[PDB]
Write an enzyme that holds these catalytic residues in place. Structure first.
Site, short mmCIF file in Angstrom:
data_model
loop_
_atom_site.label_atom_id
_atom_site.label_comp_id
_atom_site.label_asym_id
_atom_site.label_seq_id
_atom_site.Cartn_x
_atom_site.Cartn_y
_atom_site.Cartn_z
CG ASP E 43 8.18 38.38 -10.33
OD1 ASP E 43 7.44 39.18 -9.75
OD2 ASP E 43 7.86 37.85 -11.42
C1 LIG Z 1 -6.60 48.18 -19.20
C2 LIG Z 1 -5.80 47.03 -19.82
C3 LIG Z 1 -4.72 47.52 -20.78
C4 LIG Z 1 -3.61 46.50 -20.99
C5 LIG Z 1 -2.42 47.10 -21.74
C6 LIG Z 1 -1.15 46.28 -21.54
C7 LIG Z 1 0.07 46.89 -22.23
C8 LIG Z 1 1.15 45.84 -22.48
C9 LIG Z 1 2.52 46.44 -22.80
C10 LIG Z 1 3.62 45.41 -22.59
C11 LIG Z 1 5.00 45.91 -23.01
C12 LIG Z 1 6.02 44.77 -23.00
O1 LIG Z 1 5.69 43.71 -23.39
S1 LIG Z 1 7.71 45.01 -22.39
C13 LIG Z 1 8.68 43.52 -22.76
C14 LIG Z 1 8.76 42.61 -21.53
N1 LIG Z 1 9.61 41.46 -21.81
C15 LIG Z 1 10.94 41.36 -21.24
O2 LIG Z 1 11.34 42.21 -20.54
C16 LIG Z 1 11.82 40.15 -21.55
C17 LIG Z 1 12.78 39.68 -20.46
N2 LIG Z 1 12.02 39.19 -19.33
C18 LIG Z 1 12.29 39.69 -18.00
O3 LIG Z 1 13.15 40.49 -17.84
C19 LIG Z 1 11.48 39.18 -16.81
O4 LIG Z 1 10.85 37.98 -17.16
C20 LIG Z 1 10.46 40.23 -16.38
C21 LIG Z 1 9.08 39.92 -16.96
C22 LIG Z 1 10.89 41.61 -16.87
C23 LIG Z 1 10.36 40.23 -14.85
O5 LIG Z 1 11.39 41.03 -14.34
P1 LIG Z 1 12.23 40.53 -13.02
O6 LIG Z 1 12.06 39.04 -12.87
O7 LIG Z 1 13.69 40.86 -13.23
O8 LIG Z 1 11.73 41.23 -11.78
#
Ligand SMILES: CCCCCCCCCCCC(=O)SCCNC(=O)CCNC(=O)[C@H](O)C(C)(C)COP(=O)(O)O
Ligand SMILES: CCCCCCCCCCCCCCCCCC(=O)OC[C@H](COP(=O)([O-])OCC(O)COP(=O)([O-])OC[C@@H](COC(=O)CCCCCCCCCCCCCCCCC)OC(=O)CCCCCCCCCCCCCCCCC)OC(=O)CCCCCCCCCCCCCCCCC
Ligand SMILES: CCCCCCCCCCCCCCCCCC(=O)OC[C@H](COP(=O)([O-])OCC(O)COP(=O)([O-])OC[C@@H](COC(=O)CCCCCCCCCCCCCCCCC)OC(=O)CCCCCCCCCCCCCCCCC)OC(=O)CCCCCCCCCCCCCCCCC
Ligand SMILES: CCCCCCCCCCCCCCCCC[C@@H](O)O[C@H](CO[C@H](O)CCCCCCCCCCCCCCC)COP(=O)(O)OCC[N+](C)(C)C
Ligand SMILES: CCCCCCCCCCCCCCCCC[C@@H](O)O[C@H](CO[C@H](O)CCCCCCCCCCCCCCC)COP(=O)(O)OCC[N+](C)(C)C
Ligand SMILES: CCCCCCCC/C=C\CCCCCCCC(=O)OC[C@H](COP(=O)(O)OCCN)OC(=O)CCCCCCC/C=C\CCCCCCCC
Ligand SMILES: Nc1ncnc2c1ncn2[C@@H]1O[C@H](COP(=O)(O)OP(=O)(O)O)[C@@H](O)[C@H]1O
Lengths: 98, 459, 49, 104, 88, 55, 347, 320, 54
Positions: E43
Site C-alpha cells: 500500500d
Molecule cells: C518511537 C515510537 C514513537 C511512536 C509515535 C507514533 C506517532 C503516531 C502519530 C499518528 C498520527 C495519525 O494517526 S494520522 C491519521 C491517519 N488516519 C487516516 O489517514 C485515515 C484514512 N486512512 C487512510 O487514508 C489509509 O488507511 C492510510 C492509513 C493513510 C494508508 O494510506 P494509503 O492506503 O492511501 O497508501
C-alpha cells in the site's frame, strides 16, 4: 655539546616537524609554533648563562615579546577563518591554486 | 659615417611631423636622397677598410649591402602605400617608423666594428620585423609565423652571445680588426668543437640552412609585401655577412667541421629546388627559391676560398634584388585577385603585356642567364666547388637544370595559356607598379656593367 | 562648451606653472655653477693653470 | 539571434580608375597622386639612377689597379734586363728567418 | 575528473538493487515492470518508504507529487534520468 | 614527408609538446598547505643531507 | 581601513625593512623581519574577503616558519661562536638553515608554492608591494653573507626557480599569477649571480623592480586582472596597450631593450669564472618567459579582440586618479640599455 | 582640491553634513504613471535635487557639452524599435536593457556623490534596485533569452552591492486598463503596440518582488492613482517617517569615506558593466569596434582631455 | 578583402582558469569577477540549556 643542548635541539626539530605536517586543526599548528618559540628561548638562555654573557641576558625576554605578537597574529587570523567556515580546518583554505 | 645614420633618425620625426596626406612623398624623397648619399661608400681601397671611428667601419663587403638596404627602403615605401590606404594616420606613421627603425638597425649592424655591438643590433632587428609581421599580416597564421620567426632565431643566437663573451674573456677584445690581426689556430678538442658550433649556428639558422629553414616559408608568406621584401633581400644576408666575418677565428676546425653543413647545403639545395616544382602557393615558391640560393651561398662560405667569397657576395646582392622583384610581382596579382594560388589567375600576358615583360626579365634573371651578376656569382661558386672536389659538378649541375624548370614553370603558369573566364577585375597596371619593377630591374643590369663593385674584398 | 566646471579653466594654474619654471631654472643655474666650480677645482688640483 | 557577434560587412575593393581615369596608382587625391609620381620619377630615375651610375663609373682608382700594372711593368723590365728570374718562390728573405736549431 | 557519466543501465541496476533490499519484496517475483500495489501487494506507505530509499540512493529530493505517481521501477528510472538529463 | 612532417616533428613540435607537458605538471597544484608543507619538510631534510653534510 | 592607520602600517613595513638593512646585530635583523611581517599582514587584507584572508593566512604561516628557522640558525651560530654580528657565518649547518629560511622568505624554488597563491589572493596594490618591496630585506642579508654561501645549494635553487617560473607561467590566464611566476624566475636570476657578484644582483633587482612597477601600474590603470579583461583595453585606450606591449618585450629580455642588460651582464659575469653550461641553460629557460610574454602581447596589443556595447559609455570618462611615476618607470624599463656602464655606480 | 585620503585625514567628514534631510528618495511606478510629476513636486517641497529618469543618452548629458551624441556612438539601441520589433534577431532588446542599467548605475553614483558632497537630499525616478522588473517583463514575453538574464544577474550582483539602498521608496499604483487608456490618449505611435501582458508582467514583478524585498530594508509609501496629485499630503506623510531600520543609520565616517571615493571616479563605477562574457546581443566585432571608436574620437570635443581641445575654444594649452 | 581579427571562438581559449585544460583541471572554475566568493551558509548552532526545575 652536552646532552641537554641536544635535547633542546631535538625538541626544536620535533616542533618543526609538527608544524610542517598538518593534521586538520590550525590551532595545533599554532601550538607547534609556540613550542618552537619556547625551545628557542630555552636554548638561547642556556647558551647565554653558560658563557656569562651579561648584556645578552635581555635577549631572551625580547624574543618572548615578539613571540607574543606572532601568537596574537595567528590567533587573530584563526578567528577570521572560523568566521568564514565555522571551523578552523586547513582544508577550507583552498580557494587559491598554483 | 654618421652622415648616413643621422638622416634616418631625422626621417623619424619628419614622418611623425608630416601632414596627414604627405607622409609617403616626404618619406620616399628623403629615402632616395639617403640612398644617393650612401652611394659614396662604394669607393673602397685595395688593402684595408674605411675605419671611420672606433665604433663604425666600412669594407668592400658591407658597402654593397648598405647600398642595397638604403635603396630597398624607398621601394618598400612605394610597395606599401597601396594596401595601407584605408589605415589611420597614426598606424601609417607607426608602419613607416617600423621600416625606418629596421633600416637604422641594419645600417648600424653592417658597419659595427665590435662583435657584441654587432650581436646587439643583429638581434634588435627582430622587434620591428616581428611587429610588422604579427600586426600588419593578413591571415591568422601570421601569429604562429611570428613565433616561428622569433624562437628559431633566438635559440640560435643566445648560445652565440655566450661564446662571444667567452672569447672576450680569453683574447681581451672582440674588435674585428684586432681579432683578425691577433688570430690564432683553433685546436681539436670538444670545447673548441662546441665553441665553433655556438659561433656558427646563429648565422646558419639565419641563412637559413636546410633542415633549420622551416621558419622561412611561414615568415615570408604571412608577412606584408614590405616585410617579405626586407626579409628576403636583406635579413637573409645577415647570416652570410656574419659567417664571412666570424670564420676568421675558426680555422682550421672548419676544415672538417663543414662536412655536415656542406652535405646539408648541397642535398637540401637539390631538395628545395625540387620542392619548388610542386607548389600551389606562388609566394612559397619564391621562398623556397631563396632557400636554394642561400644554400649555394652557404657552400661558398664554407669552402673558404677567394673565388668562393667573391661568388658568394655577388650571389647575395643578385638574390636580394631578384627575390624582392619576384615578391613584388606576385603581390601585384595578389592585390588584383586576393588569392595566392598560382593556377587561379592564368594567361595574364594577354591582359597585362608590360607586366608579362617584367615577369620574363625577373624569371630570366632568376635562372642566372649570362652575363647577369646572378650567373657571375653562381659560376664563381661552382668553379670554387669544382676545385674543392670534382664530383660536386654533378649536384650543382642538377640544381642548374631544376631551377630553370621551376622558374619557367612559374612564368608558363601565370602568363601563358588562356585567361580565367570568371576573373573580370584585372585592371590595367598602374604607373607605380611599373616604376617599382623598373627600379628593381635597372640596377641589376647596371651592376652587370660594372661587376667589381659587388665582388667583395677578395677582388 | 563643457557642461561641467572643468577645473582646469581657460587660464592655466599660474602657481603651479610658476613653481615648475622656477624649479627648472634654479636646477639649471645650480648645475652650471656646480660645473664651473668642478672645473676650477680640477684645474687647481692638477695644476693646469 | 542565430548570429555570434555584431560586425561590419566586408567592403568591396575600391578601383582608383573610377574617380580618376589617369590615376597613376599612388593616391586617391589626383594632385597628391600626380606629385607622388613626379617625385618618384625625378628622384629615382633622374637623380639616383643616372647620376649615381655616372658617379660610380668615374670613381677614382683607389684600388690601385693602374698603379699595380705600372709597378709590374717596371719590375718586369728591370728583371728581364738584368737576367734575374721574374718571380721568386720566397716572398721573404731567408736571412731574416731563424729556423729552429735541431730538427732531430 | 568527477564521477563517470551515469547511464540508463547503471540507473536501472541501482534501482533494482535498492528495491530488492526492501525486506518486504521477494527478489524473484520483482521485475522492472512490476506495479507496486498490484504485483507486489504494497500500500501507500511502503511506496513512500521505497521513494525515500531512492532518495537515499541517488542523493536528491523528490517531492510528494512526482513521487506519488512512480508506480513501477521503470517510472522511477525514467524520472531519475529526466531529472539528471541522462539520455544514454 | 620531410618538410611538412619530420622536420616539423623533431625540432619545434617536440619542444612545444615537452614544454606543455612540464607546464601542466608544474602548475597543477591543489593549493593545500598540507601537501607543500610536507614537501618543504622533505626539501629541508634533503638539503641537510645532500649539500650540508658535504662541506 | 583608516587612511592614518594605513599610512602607519605602510611606514611600519618600510621601517622593518630599513631595520633589516641598517643593522649589524642578528637580533635586530630578526626583529626587523618580525615587524615587517606584523605590519604586512593587515595590508594584504585591506579589502576584506575570503580570498584575502586565505592569502594572509598562508603568507603568515610561511613567513613565521621561515623566521623560526632564521632564529634557530642565529642561535646555532652563537653556540659555535659567540658572535652576533652579521658576518661569514662560522657554522655550516647554521648557514644551510639560514639559506633555506631566506629562500623560503623570497619564494625561491622549491619554497615557491605560496607566491602565486598569495599574489592571486590579494589586490593589485598589495601584490605590487609584495612583489617589489618585500624582496629587499632577504636579498640584503644574502648579499651580506654572500662570501660564506654554498654555491651548490644556491645555484640549484636558482636554476629550479628559473625552470619552475617558466613552466608555471606557461599555464596561466590570470595576470597576477603570471606576475608571480615571472617574479620567481627573476629571483632565480638574481640569486644565480649572488655567489659571484652582488653588484650584478643589485642591478638585476633594480631593473626588475622598475619593470614590475611599470607593469603593475599599467595593470592598475587599466583595471584588468585576467587576460580577457585586458584584451578589452585596446578599444578604450590603445596607448596603454602599446606601452604595455613594449614593456612586455623588455621583460622578455630582447635587445635593444633595457631588460636585456641584466641577463647579459650576469652571463658575462658568470663567464669570468668558468661556469659556461649554467648561463646557456638559463637563457634557454628564459625563452619560456619570453614566450608567454609574447602570448600576452598577442592577446592585448598586436590583435584586436571583440568588445562589448557598454564600453561606449566608458569612452565618455577619463581616468580620475593619476599615477605620477608611470612615464618615468616605462622609459626606464625600455630605453636604458645605452646607459649600461653606469652600473659601476652600484659598487 | 580633489577629494581623497588627504581631505579625510584633516577636516572633511561626511557625517556632519547630514541634517535630517539627506533622505534618498525614489518614486517607482509602472509605465505612463504620474511618478515623474510626483517626484518633481516632492523635490520642490522638500528642497531636494530632482534627477529625471535616466534614458539612453544620460551619460552624454554629463560629459563634454550636455547635448546627446549619435545613437551609433552612444547606446547603439532603440526604444522605438524595441516597441516595433521586440523579438528582433539583432539583439536590440537586451542591448537596450543593459545600456539602461549602466545609465541607471551612473545616475545613482552621481546622486550619491552629490548627497555625500553637499548634504542635500536627492529624488530619483527609478533606481538600479528597480530596473530588474523590466528585465523580468522581457523574459516572460520571450523578448530576451535566459543567458541574457544570467548576464544581467551577474552584473547586478557585482555592481549594486557597493551602494546604499534609498531611504524611502514611493510607489504609485495604476491598474493596467487605466495605463492602456493613458497610452492610447498619449499619441506616441510606438507605445500603442505595448500589449497588456507586458504591463501586467511589469506590475507583477514590482508588487511581488521589489516592494516585499524593499520593505525589509525600509518602509514603503504606496499611493493609488487619485492620492498622488496631492503632493503636500504625500510630503507630510514622508516627513513623519521613522527611518531607523536600514543600513543607513549603521554608517560611520570611514564607510562614508569609502563610498565617497567610490561614487566619484565613474570608471570604477562602470568597471564591471563590460565584463568579458560574450553574448551575441552585446558583443561587437573588432572591425566595427575600431571603426566606431575612430568615429567617436573625431567628435569636436572628444579627441583630448576636457581642457585640451583647441577646436572647441581651449586656450593656453601649451601651459596647462 | 580585409585583415583577419580574433572572434569570440578565438577569444574563448583564454577565458578559462588555466591554459591547456586536462581532465583534472577541467572542473576548476575561474575566480569571481570581483574577488568575493559567495558567503557559505555555515550556520552555527547555539547552546541549549535546561534552567530548572532543580
Ligand atoms: C518511537 C515510537 C514513537 C511512536 C509515535 C507514533 C506517532 C503516531 C502519530 C499518528 C498520527 C495519525 O494517526 S494520522 C491519521 C491517519 N488516519 C487516516 O489517514 C485515515 C484514512 N486512512 C487512510 O487514508 C489509509 O488507511 C492510510 C492509513 C493513510 C494508508 O494510506 P494509503 O492506503 O492511501 O497508501
Ligand atoms: C646584344 C643586343 C644589343 C641591343 C642594344 C640595345 C639594348 C637596349 C637594352 C635596354 C635596357 C634593358 C631593358 C630591359 C627591360 C625592358 C624595357 C621595356 O619594357 O621595353 C619595352 C619597349 C617597348 O615595347 P612594348 O611595345 O612596350 O612591348 C611590351 C610587350 O610586353 C612586348 O615585349 P617584348 O616581347 O618586346 O619583350 C621585350 C624584349 C626585350 O626585353 C628584355 O628582355 C630586356 C632584358 C633582357 C634580358 C636581361 C637579362 C639577361 C642579362 C643580360 C645583362 C645585360 C646587361 C647589359 C647592360 C644593360 C644596362 C641596362 O624581349 C626580348 O627581346 C627577349 C629578352 C631576352 C633577351 C636574351 C638576350 C641574351 C643576352 C644577349 C646579350 C646580352 C649581353 C650583351 C653583350 C654580350 C657581349 C657583346 O621595347 C624596347 O624598348 C626594346 C626592348 C629591349 C630589348 C633589348 C634586348 C637586347 C639588349 C640586351 C641588354 C642590353 C645590352 C646593351 C649593350 C650591348 C650588349
Ligand atoms: C632611353 C633609355 C630607356 C631605358 C633603358 C635603360 C637606361 C639606363 C641608363 C642608366 C644610367 C646610365 C649611366 C652610365 C654612365 C656611363 C658613361 C661612361 O662611362 O662613358 C664611357 C664611354 C666614354 O669613355 P671615357 O672614358 O669617358 O673617354 C676617355 C677618353 O679620354 C675620351 O676619348 P676622346 O679624347 O677620343 O673623346 C671622345 C669624345 C669625342 O670624340 C669624337 O668626337 C670623335 C668620334 C669619332 C668620329 C670621327 C669621324 C666622324 C666625323 C667625320 C666627318 C666630320 C669631320 C670632318 C668634317 C668634314 C666632313 C667630311 O666622345 C666621347 O667622349 C664619348 C661619348 C660620351 C658618352 C657618355 C655616355 C653617358 C651616359 C649617361 C646617360 C645615360 C642615359 C642615355 C642618354 C645618352 C644620350 C642618348 O662612353 C661610351 O659609351 C664609349 C662607347 C663608344 C665606343 C665605340 C663602340 C665600340 C663597339 C665594339 C663592340 C662591338 C660588338 C657589338 C656591341 C655593340 C654595342 C655598341
Ligand atoms: C636539422 C638540422 C640541424 C643542423 C645540424 C648541425 C650538424 C651538427 C653535427 C656536428 C658535427 C660533428 C660533431 C663532432 C665532431 C666529430 C664527430 C664524431 O663522430 O667524430 C669522432 C668522435 O668519436 C665518437 O664519435 C665520439 C662521439 C660520439 C657521441 C656524439 C653523439 C652523436 C649522436 C648523433 C645525434 C644527432 C645530433 C644532432 C641533434 C639535433 C671523431 O673521433 P675522436 O678523435 O674521438 O673525436 C674528435 C675530438 N677529439 C679530437 C677531441 C678527440
Ligand atoms: C626602353 C627601351 C630600352 C632599349 C633602348 C636603349 C638605348 C641605348 C641605351 C642602352 C646602353 C647600352 C650599354 C652599352 C655599354 C656602355 C656603358 C659603359 O661603357 O659604361 C660602363 C660604366 O658602367 C658603370 O660603371 C656602372 C653603373 C653603376 C651601377 C650603380 C646603379 C645605381 C645605384 C642604385 C642603387 C643600387 C642597388 C644595388 C646595390 C649594389 C663602363 O665601365 P668602365 O670599364 O669602368 O669605364 C672605363 C672608363 N671610365 C672608367 C673612365 C668611365
Ligand atoms: C630545458 C628547457 C629548454 C627551454 C626551451 C624553450 C623553447 C622556447 C619556445 C617555447 C614554446 C612553448 C610552447 C608551449 O608551451 O605551448 C605549445 C603551443 C600552445 O599554444 P598556446 O599559444 O600556448 O595556446 C593558445 C590557445 N590555447 O602550441 C603551439 O602551437 C606553439 C607554436 C609556436 C612554437 C614555435 C617554437 C619554435 C621552436 C624552434 C626550436 C627552438 C627550441 C628552443 C630550444 C632549442 C634546443 C636546444
Ligand atoms: N528599463 C526600461 N526598459 C524598457 N523601457 C523603459 C525602461 N525604462 C523606461 N522605459 C520606457 O521609457 C518610456 C517613458 O518612461 P515612463 O517613466 O514610464 O513615462 P513618463 O516619462 O511619462 O514618466 C516608456 O515608454 C517606458 O517604456
Amino acid at each position: 655539546m652536552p646532552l641537554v643542548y641536544m635535547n633542546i635541539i631535538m625538541a626544536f626539530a620535533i616542533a618543526l616537524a609538527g608544524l610542517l605536517m598538518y593534521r586538520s586543526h590550525l590551532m595545533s599548528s599554532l601550538l607547534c609554533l609556540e613550542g618552537m618559540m619556547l625551545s628557542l628561548f630555552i636554548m638561547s638562555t642556556l647558551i647565554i648563562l653558560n658563557t656569562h654573557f651579561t648584556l645578552a641576558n635581555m635577549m631572551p625576554i625580547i624574543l618572548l615579546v615578539f613571540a607574543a605578537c606572532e601568537a596574537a597574529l595567528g590567533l587573530s587570523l584563526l578567528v577570521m577563518v572560523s568566521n568564514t567556515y565555522g571551523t578552523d580546518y586547513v582544508q577550507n583554505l583552498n580557494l587559491l591554486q598554483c | 659615417m654618421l652622415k648616413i645614420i643621422i638622416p634616418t633618425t631625422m626621417l623619424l620625426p619628419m614622418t611623425w611631423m608630416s601632414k596627414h596626406n604627405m607622409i609617403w612623398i616626404n618619406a620616399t624623397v628623403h629615402s632616395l636622397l639617403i640612398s644617393l648619399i650612401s652611394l659614396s661608400l662604394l669607393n673602397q681601397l685595395g688593402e684595408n677598410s674605411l675605419n671611420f671611428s672606433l665604433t663604425f667601419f666600412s669594407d668592400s663587403l658591407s658597402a654593397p649591402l648598405l647600398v642595397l638596404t638604403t635603396w630597398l627602403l624607398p621601394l618598400m615605401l612605394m610597395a606599401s602605400q597601396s594596401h595601407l590606404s584605408k589605415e589611420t594616420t597614426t598606424r601609417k606613421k607607426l608602419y613607416i617608423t617600423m621600416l625606418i627603425l629596421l633600416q637604422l638597425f641594419l645600417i648600424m649592424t653592417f658597419t659595427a666594428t665590435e662583435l657584441i655591438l654587432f650581436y646587439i643590433l643583429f638581434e634588435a632587428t627582430l622587434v620591428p620585423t616581428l611587429i610588422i609581421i604579427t600586426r600588419w599580416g593578413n591571415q591568422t597564421e601570421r601569429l604562429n609565423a611570428g613565433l616561428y620567426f622569433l624562437f628559431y632565431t633566438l635559440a640560435g643566437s643566445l648560445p652565440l652571445l655566450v661564446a662571444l663573451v667567452y672569447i672576450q674573456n680569453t683574447t681581451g677584445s672582440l674588435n674585428f680588426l684586432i681579432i683578425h690581426y691577433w688570430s690564432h689556430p683553433l685546436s681539436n678538442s670538444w670545447s673548441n668543437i662546441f665553441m665553433w658550433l655556438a659561433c656558427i649556428m646563429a648565422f646558419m639558422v639565419k641563412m637559413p640552412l636546410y633542415g633549420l629553414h622551416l621558419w622561412l616559408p611561414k615568415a615570408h608568406v604571412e608577412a606584408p609585401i614590405a616585410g617579405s621584401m626586407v626579409l628576403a633581400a636583406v635579413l637573409l644576408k645577415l647570416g652570410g655577412y656574419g659567417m664571412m666575418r666570424i670564420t676568421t677565428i675558426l680555422n682550421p676546425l672548419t676544415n672538417y667541421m663543414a662536412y655536415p653543413f656542406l652535405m646539408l647545403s648541397m642535398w637540401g639545395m637539390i631538395m628545395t629546388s625540387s620542392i619548388c616544382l610542386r607548389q600551389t602557393d606562388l609566394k612559397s615558391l619564391i621562398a623556397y627559391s631563396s632557400v636554394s640560393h642561400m644554400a649555394l651561398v652557404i657552400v661558398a662560405i664554407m669552402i673558404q676560398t677567394p673565388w668562393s667569397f667573391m661568388g658568394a657576395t655577388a650571389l647575395m646582392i643578385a638574390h636580394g634584388l631578384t627575390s624582392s622583384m619576384l615578391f613584388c610581382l606576385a603581390n601585384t596579382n595578389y592585390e588584383r585577385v586576393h588569392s595566392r594560388t598560382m593556377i587561379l589567375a592564368r594567361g595574364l600576358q594577354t591582359l597585362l603585356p608590360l607586366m608579362a615583360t617584367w615577369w620574363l626579365v625577373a624569371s630570366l634573371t632568376n635562372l642566372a642567364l649570362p652575363p647577369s651578376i646572378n650567373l657571375i656569382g653562381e659560376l664563381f661558386i661552382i668553379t670554387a666547388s669544382f676545385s674543392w672536389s670534382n664530383i660536386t659538378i654533378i649536384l650543382m649541375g642538377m640544381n642548374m637544370m631544376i631551377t630553370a624548370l621551376y622558374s619557367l614553370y612559374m612564368l608558363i603558369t601565370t602568363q601563358r595559356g588562356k585567361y580565367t573566364h570568371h576573373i573580370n577585375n584585372i585592371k590595367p597596371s598602374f604607373t607605380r607598379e611599373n616604376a617599382l619593377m623598373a627600379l628593381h630591374i635597372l640596377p641589376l643590369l647596371l651592376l652587370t656593367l660594372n661587376p667589381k663593385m659587388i665582388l667583395g674584398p677578395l677582388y | 562648451k563643457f557642461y561641467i566646471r572643468e577645473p582646469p579653466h581657460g587660464s592655466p594654474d599660474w602657481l603651479k606653472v610658476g613653481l615648475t619654471l622656477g624649479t627648472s631654472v634654479f636646477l639649471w643655474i645650480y648645475l652650471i655653477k656646480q660645473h664651473k666650480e668642478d672645473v676650477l677645482e680640477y684645474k687647481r688640483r692638477n695644476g693646469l693653470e | 539571434p542565430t548570429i555570434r557577434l555584431q560586425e561590419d560587412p566586408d567592403p568591396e575593393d575600391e578601383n582608383l580608375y573610377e574617380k580618376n581615369p589617369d590615376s597613376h596608382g599612388y593616391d586617391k587625391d589626383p594632385i597628391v597622386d600626380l606629385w607622388n609620381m613626379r617625385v618618384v620619377f625625378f628622384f629615382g630615375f633622374s637623380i639616383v639612377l643616372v647620376l649615381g651610375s655616372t658617379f660610380v663609373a668615374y670613381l677614382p682608382d683607389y684600388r690601385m689597379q693602374e698603379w699595380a700594372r705600372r709597378e709590374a711593368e717596371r719590375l718586369v723590365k728591370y728583371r728581364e734586363a738584368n737576367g734575374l728570374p721574374l718571380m721568386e718562390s720566397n716572398c721573404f728573405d731567408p736571412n731574416k728567418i731563424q729556423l729552429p736549431e735541431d730538427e732531430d | 575528473s568527477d564521477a563517470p557519466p551515469l547511464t540508463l543501465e547503471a540507473i536501472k541496476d541501482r534501482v533494482l538493487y535498492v528495491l530488492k533490499l526492501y525486506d518486504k519484496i521477494d527478489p524473484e517475483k520483482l521485475s522492472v515492470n512490476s506495479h507496486f500495489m498490484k504485483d507486489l501487494g504494497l500500500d501507500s506507505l511502503d511506496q513512500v518508504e521505497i521513494i525515500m530509499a531512492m532518495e537515499d540512493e541517488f542523493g536528491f529530493e523528490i517531492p510528494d507529487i512526482d513521487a506519488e505517481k512512480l508506480m513501477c521501477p521503470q517510472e522511477i528510472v525514467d524520472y531519475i534520468a529526466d531529472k539528471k538529463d541522462v539520455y544514454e | 614527408l620531410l618538410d611538412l612532417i619530420w622536420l616539423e616533428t623533431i625540432l619545434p613540435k617536440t619542444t612545444s609538446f615537452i614544454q606543455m607537458k612540464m607546464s601542466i605538471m608544474v602548475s597543477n597544484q591543489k593549493g593545500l598547505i598540507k601537501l607543500y608543507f610536507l614537501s618543504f619538510l622533505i626539501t629541508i631534510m634533503i638539503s641537510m643531507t645532500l649539500f650540508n653534510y658535504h662541506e | 581601513m583608516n587612511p592614518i592607520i594605513y599610512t602607519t602600517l605602510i611606514m611600519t613595513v618600510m621601517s622593518g625593512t630599513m631595520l633589516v638593512m641598517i643593522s649589524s646585530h642578528w637580533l635586530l635583523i630578526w626583529i626587523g623581519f618580525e615587524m615587517n611581517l606584523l605590519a604586512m599582514i593587515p595590508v594584504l587584507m585591506k579589502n576584506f574577503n575570503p580570498r584575502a584572508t586565505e592569502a594572509a593566512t598562508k603568507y603568515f604561516l610561511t613567513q613565521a616558519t621561515a623566521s623560526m628557522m632564521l632564529m634557530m640558525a642565529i642561535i646555532i651560530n652563537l653556540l659555535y661562536s659567540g658572535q652576533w654580528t652579521i658576518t661569514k657565518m662560522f657554522n655550516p649547518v647554521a648557514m644551510t638553515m639560514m639559506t633555506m629560511a631566506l629562500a623560503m622568505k623570497l619564494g625561491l624554488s622549491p619554497f615557491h608554492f605560496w607566491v602565486p597563491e598569495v599574489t592571486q589572493g590579494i589586490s593589485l596594490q598589495a601584490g605590487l608591494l609584495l612583489l617589489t618591496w618585500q624582496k629587499l630585506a632577504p636579498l640584503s642579508v644574502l648579499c651580506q653573507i654572500s662570501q660564506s654561501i654554498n654555491p651548490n645549494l644556491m645555484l640549484t635553487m636558482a636554476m629550479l626557480s628559473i625552470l619552475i617560473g617558466g613552466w608555471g607561467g606557461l599555464n596561466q590566464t590570470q595576470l597576477r599569477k603570471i606576475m608571480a611566476y615571472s617574479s620567481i624566475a627573476h629571483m632565480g636570476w638574481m640569486t644565480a649571480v649572488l655567489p659571484y657578484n652582488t653588484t650584478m644582483t643589485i642591478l638585476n633587482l633594480l631593473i626588475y623592480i622598475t619593470m614590475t612597477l611599470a607593469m603593475f601600474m599599467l595593470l592598475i590603470h587599466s583595471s584588468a586582472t585576467t587576460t580577457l579583461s585586458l584584451s578589452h583595453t585596446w578599444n578604450k585606450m590603445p596607448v596603454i596597450t602599446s606601452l604595455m606591449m613594449v614593456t612586455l618585450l623588455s621583460m622578455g629580455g630582447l635587445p635593444p631593450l633595457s631588460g636585456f642588460m641584466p641577463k647579459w651582464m650576469i652571463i658575462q659575469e658568470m663567464t669570468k669564472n668558468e661556469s659556461i653550461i649554467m648561463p646557456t641553460l638559463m637563457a634557454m629557460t628564459a625563452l619560456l618567459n619570453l614566450y608567454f610574454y609574447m602570448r600576452l602581447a598577442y592577446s592585448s596589443s598586436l590583435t584586436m579582440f571583440p568588445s562589448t556595447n557598454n564600453m561606449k559609455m566608458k569612452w565618455q570618462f577619463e581616468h580620475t586618479k593619476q599615477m605620477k611615476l608611470l612615464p618615468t618607470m616605462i622609459v626606464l624599463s625600455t630605453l636604458v640599455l645605452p646607459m649600461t656602464p653606469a652600473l659601476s655606480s652600484l659598487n | 582640491l580633489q577629494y581623497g585620503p588627504l581631505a579625510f585625514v584633516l577636516g572633511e567628514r561626511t557625517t556632519r553634513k547630514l541634517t535630517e534631510t539627506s533622505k534618498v528618495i525614489t518614486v517607482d511606478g509602472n509605465i505612463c504613471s504620474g511618478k515623474g510629476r510626483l517626484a518633481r513636486e516632492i523635490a520642490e517641497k522638500l528642497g531636494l535635487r530632482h534627477f529625471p529618469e535616466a534614458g539612453i543618452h544620460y551619460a552624454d548629458s554629463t560629459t563634454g557639452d550636455g547635448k546627446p551624441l549619435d545613437v551609433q556612438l552612444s547606446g547603439n539601441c532603440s526604444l522605438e524599435k524595441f516597441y516595433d520589433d521586440p523579438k528582433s534577431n539583432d539583439g536590440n532588446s537586451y542591448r537596450l536593457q543593459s545600456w539602461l542599467y549602466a545609465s541607471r548605475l551612473l545616475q545613482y553614483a552621481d546622486a550619491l556623490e552629490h548627497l555625500l558632497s553637499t548634504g542635500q537630499g536627492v529624488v530619483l525616478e527609478r533606481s538600479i534596485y528597480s530596473d530588474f522588473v523590466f528585465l523580468e517583463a522581457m523574459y516572460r514575453q520571450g523578448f530576451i533569452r535566459k543567458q541574457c538574464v544570467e548576464h544581467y544577474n551577474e552584473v547586478k550582483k557585482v555592481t549594486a552591492c557597493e551602494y546604499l539602498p534609498p531611504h524611502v521608496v514611493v510607489y504609485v499604483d495604476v491598474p493596467v486598463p487605466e495605463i492602456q487608456s493613458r497610452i492610447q490618449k498619449k499619441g506616441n505611435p510606438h507605445e500603442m503596440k505595448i500589449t497588456a501582458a507586458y504591463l501586467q508582467d511589469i506590475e507583477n514583478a514590482y508588487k511581488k518582488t521589489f516592494l516585499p524585498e524593499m520593505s525589509e530594508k525600509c518602509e514603503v509609501l504606496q499611493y493609488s492613482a487619485r492620492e498622488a496629485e496631492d503632493a503636500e499630503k504625500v510630503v507630510e506623510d514622508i516627513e513623519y517617517l521613522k527611518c531607523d531600520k536600514g543600513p543607513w543609520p549603521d554608517q560611520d565616517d570611514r564607510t562614508f569615506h569609502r563610498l565617497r571615493m567610490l561614487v566619484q571616479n565613474k570608471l570604477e563605477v562602470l568597471n564591471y558593466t563590460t565584463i568579458p562574457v560574450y553574448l551575441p546581443e552585446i558583443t561587437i566585432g573588432a572591425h566595427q569596434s575600431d571603426r566606431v571608436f575612430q568615429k567617436f574620437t573625431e567628435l569636436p570635443g572628444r579627441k583630448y582631455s576636457p581642457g585640451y581641445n583647441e577646436d572647441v575654444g581651449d586656450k593656453w594649452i601649451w601651459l596647462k | 578583402a580585409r585583415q583577419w581579427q580574433p572572434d569570440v571562438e578565438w577569444a574563448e581559449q583564454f577565458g578559462g582558469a588555466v591554459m591547456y585544460p586536462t581532465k583534472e583541471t577541467a572542473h576548476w572554475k575561474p575566480p569571481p569577477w570581483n574577488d568575493v566568493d559567495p558567503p557559505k551558509d555555515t550556520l552555527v548552532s547555539n547552546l541549549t540549556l535546561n534552567f530548572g526545575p532543580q
